Structure 1
Amino acid sequence: MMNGRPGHEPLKFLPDEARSLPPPKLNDPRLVYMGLLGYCTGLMDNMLRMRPVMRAGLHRQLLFVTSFVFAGYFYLKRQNYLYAVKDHDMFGYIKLHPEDFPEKEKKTYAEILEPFHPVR
């Protein structure tokens, strides 16, 4: 739904506005889980190739973990940009059409009469 927005560069992974966003912390649970998935992928690959599960293919396991963390970091930055621009468009549209989003006045619990349903 956000592909037709104004200023949308076509097939652009990380546009320059994403540079305004704070980057992922590089030690955060999403990237740590991505590295864990890469290590699990290496272990499962060893077990399916009938190698020793952990002490075989250390370079392969390192490459799996590194590639998973790298791809996860850049994809996470892209998704952070997408959610940020979604909230930016939502807030801008709300500010542009305030008559369709009126500030409703919530009364206190002294003028409203909630019906009482006795449990007995």
Structure 2
Amino acid sequence: MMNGRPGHEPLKFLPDEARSLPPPKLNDPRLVYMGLLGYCTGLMDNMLRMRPVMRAGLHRQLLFVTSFVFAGYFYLKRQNYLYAVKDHDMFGYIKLHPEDFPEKEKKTYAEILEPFHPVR
């Protein structure tokens, strides 16, 4: 699909149109969940290595939160680019084929006849 799309730079993480997308914010709930995941990574690693799970390994917890937020922001930018280019290819195909995707002029509820199914 995206491997076969034309104009695809091979093995490119962020192309030039991902800069044309709006970048995600740091207050976003996926990055908030990944900061919670980095803190839970430090808590689980300190619990297995038999540490005080809050007091000990604060630098490793800080690297876990920072590296999790960094990888999640970069992957969130790439996945936002992928869903945006899926929307662009679909809207371009809709603009290319209106005779293959016609507008559905739905009739009104006075005009149609829904069958009435009474329960008693």
- What CA distance in whole angstroms lies between the structure 1 residues aligned with 2:7 and 2:38? 36
The normalised TM-score by structure 1 is 0.98
- What CA distance in whole angstroms lies between the structure 1 residues aligned with 2:53 and 2:2? 44
- What CA distance in whole angstroms lies between the structure 2 residues aligned with 1:63 and 1:25? 20
Give a deviation string over 1:63-89, Cα, whole Å, max 9, x none.
100000001000000000000000000
- What CA distance in whole angstroms lies between the structure 1 residues aligned with 2:71 and 2:114? 54
Deviation at 1:104, TM superposition (A): 1.4
**Which ranges of 4 or more aligned residues in structure 1 deviate by more than 3 Å?**
none
Residue 113 (structure 2) aligns with = 113
Q: How many residues align?
A: 120
% identity of equivalent residues? 100
Give a deviation string over 1:37-87, Cα, whole Å, max 9, x none.
010000000000001111001111001000000010000000000000000
The normalised TM-score by structure 2 is 0.98
- What CA distance in whole angstroms lies between the structure 2 residues aligned with 1:76 and 1:88? 18
- What CA distance in whole angstroms lies between the structure 1 residues aligned with 2:94 and 2:58? 53
- What CA distance in whole angstroms lies between the structure 2 residues aligned with 1:4 and 1:117? 50
Structural RMSD (CA): 0.6
- What CA distance in whole angstroms lies between the structure 2 residues aligned with 1:28 and 1:15? 22
Deviation at 1:2, TM superposition (A): 1.7
Deviation at 1:111, TM superposition (A): 1.0
- What CA distance in whole angstroms lies between the structure 2 residues aligned with 1:24 and 1:73? 7
Residue 71 (structure 2) aligns with = 71
Deviation at 1:26, TM superposition (A): 1.0
Gaps of 5+ in 1: none
